[PDB]
Swiss-Prot record:
Localization of this protein: Nucleus
Record PTM text: Lactylation by AARS1 promotes nuclear localization and stabilization of YAP1, leading to increased Hippo signaling pathway. Delactylated by SIRT1.
UniProt name for this protein: Transcriptional enhancer factor TEF-1
Gene: TEAD1
Source species: Homo sapiens
Tissue: Preferentially expressed in skeletal muscle. Lower levels in pancreas, placenta, and heart.
Intrachain disulfide bonds: none
UniProt DNA-binding region: 2-78
Subunit structure: Interacts with YAP1 and WWTR1/TAZ.
Shown segment, full-protein numbering: 28 to 104 of 426
Record's disease association: Sveinsson chorioretinal atrophy: Characterized by symmetrical lesions radiating from the optic disk involving the retina and the choroid.
Length: 82
């Protein structure tokens, strides 16, 4: 249990993460009409934009992408044993 696991990170950061992960889940909506707007960069920028609007605090993108991938693993455990 290194000192790094002492929750040195602010709780407002980890909180803003759930807000972006809660707002942007692994499912619910999948559309991107680029033919019209012609301006739609990586979705990772959408999750980072949220945390950036929280309080101008950090805005991790790789950490917010990894968190969304973890949610997909929870759905994979829905193997109906019948």
């Amino acid at each position: 249990m290194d000192n790094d696991a002492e929750g040195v990170w602010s709780p407002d950061i980890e909180q803003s993460f759930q807000e972006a992960l809660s707002i942007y889940p692994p499912c619910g909506r999948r559309k991107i009409i680029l033919s019209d707007e012609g301006k739609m960069y990586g979705r990772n920028e959408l999750i980072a934009r949220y945390i950036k609007l929280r309080t101008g605090k950090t805005r991790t993108r790789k950490q917010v992408s990894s968190h969304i991938q973890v949610l997909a693993r929870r759905k994979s455990r829905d193997l109906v044993p019948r």
